[PDB]
Design a protein around this ligand. Sequence first.
Ligand code: HEM
Length: 363
Amino acid sequence: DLQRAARDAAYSMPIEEINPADPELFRTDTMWPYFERLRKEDPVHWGVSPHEDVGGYWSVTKYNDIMAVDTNHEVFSSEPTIVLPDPADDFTLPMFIAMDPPKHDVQRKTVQPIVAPNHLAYLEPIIRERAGKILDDLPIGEEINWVDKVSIELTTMTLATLFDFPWNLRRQTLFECVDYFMRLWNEMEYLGNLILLIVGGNDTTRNTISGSVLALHQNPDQDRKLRENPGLIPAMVSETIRWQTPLAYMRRRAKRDFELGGKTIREGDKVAMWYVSGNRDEEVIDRPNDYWIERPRVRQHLSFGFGVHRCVGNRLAELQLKIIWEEILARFPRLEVVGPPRRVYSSFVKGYEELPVVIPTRN
Ligand code: HEM
């Protein structure tokens, strides 16, 4: 089908021309063969994009390589940004994800409370109630865009719930403040930090909900295993977060000359940590291109990163999705995917815009 044509085109073409950051590979879902080939023949790979903002950059495609970059913030700087294209000046709000340790470590401490375990324990029964209602309102035996009707709805609910937003003069004035800045974003320390949490927990949680549904459509063996024993939901949530890799990569910038995969990454070079490709390294992961809930070491995966920038919201994400999926199995014995998805046109955000689903029956 498509996956074969791309395998042909990828192994055929001259390896230096492989530009993994092409967003048209990620939307057509044809990017796996390119990454597989690099993983073998050119693990640390110099490529060039047609786009200026990007230009030439290193693709780090293997698990251990990626870790060596992620964990080493002395050499590999999260400044000035963490996406490939260099910063404009549309949005100058201070993101601590694109800040380096001393300054970075301080700002992070300001958000660790809001995602602390005793606060998660407060939120759980609320998230569950609220998820329960969103799901009780879905239509039965009628086709819906799962992304708009379920993933966005549930994702919006969680973020609202996290910050006790509306869903009174100061509570209301803060929401409005936040809504303002989030709109501008799409088109000042503590405010950025709060905007980062929202941005960093929106499309990632969204896409993992849409992801799960497709994964189970593609593996009816593993749907059965899940509905038979619901104790496997946290496993399934892990394996989806690997399988789907909502943030495909994160970039860094070398502060000195550095040797990785026997190649000299030069000072000031851009380095793309391809988590999407590292999550499928045969060398570290058994049966990497298999949706496998009961795979051993289900938790060992790159999708939340490693090192000082490791997703601060990882346990909230896993608790959100756990509750969501408890509540989904309770209500719907089938989530039949009736048409092919329509994927986001980005090599950063690996996600869905459309996912046609029918829910036949309830309870
Ligand atoms: C499935 C869900 C999620 C995935 C896959 C994900 C993935 C990531 C990744 C890959 C990073 C960068 C790691 C690195 O550079 O080494 C990151 C950072 C971050 N994520 Fe998430 N994330 C998820 C959910 C969330 C949630 C729910 C929140 C907040 C409620 C959140 C907030 C953040 C923040 C604030 C950062 C920056 C951390 C720092 O700079 O120290 N994420 N996330």
